[PDB]
């Protein structure tokens, strides 16, 4: 019925690939910095509007 | 089979065959050590960015 098999003496390790996580961290950090820059741009725009 | 008194069976090991097999096994063991070193450096660069 589609089930697997059992192997004695073995163990299934985590299926986490430590390679792609670092590049994903780089991309996430850059995207977060870009969004924070957008927040700063909006705040600066509104501040210089209200400086009048 | 038949038996024979006053005699014994040997160890059926030839040093000629084992010594050549030991040399081959050692290199195979040496070789895989390169992969660990290669995988170690290939990961060291990534974490250090």
DSSP conformation letters of B7-45:
--------HHHHHHHHHHHHHHHHHHHHHHHHHHHHHHH
> Quick one: how far is CA B13 from the chain centroid?
17
Cited resolution, angstroms: 3.3
Burial (CB < 10 A; 0-12, 13-18, 19+), residue B37, is exposed
d(CA B47, CA B45): 6
- As given in the structure block, the two tokens for residue A8 are 């004695």
Which helix (H) or strand (E) segment is A3 a member of? none
Residue A22 neighbours by CB under 8 Å, 6+ apart: B46, B47, B49
User: Which backbone phi and psi does A37 adopt, to 5 degrees?
Assistant: -65, -40
Residue B26 neighbours by CB under 8 Å, 6+ apart: none
- As given in the structure block, the two tokens for residue B45 are 């660069």
In a mutational test of the B interface, the residue from A18, A20, A21, A22 whose CB has the highest number of chain B CBs within 10 Å is A22
CB of B40 less than 8 A from some CB of A:
no
Experimental method, per PDB record: cryo-EM
Buried b (16+ CB within 10 A) or exposed e, A11-47: eeeeeeeeeeeeeeeeeeeeeeeeeeeeeeeeeeeee
């Amino acid at each position: 019925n589609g089930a697997g098999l059992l192997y004695q003496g073995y163990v299934e390790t985590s299926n986490v690939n430590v390679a792609e996580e670092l590049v994903n961290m780089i991309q996430v950090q850059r995207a977060y910095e870009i969004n924070s820059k957008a927040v700063s741009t909006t705040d600066q725009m509104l501040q210089k509007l209200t400086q009048l | 089979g038949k038996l024979t008194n006053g005699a014994l069976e040997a160890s059926n090991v030839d040093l000629s065959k084992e010594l050549v097999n030991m040399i081959v096994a050692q290199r195979n063991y040496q070789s895989n050590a390169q992969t660990i070193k290669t995988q170690d450096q290939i990961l060291n660069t990534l974490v250090n960015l």
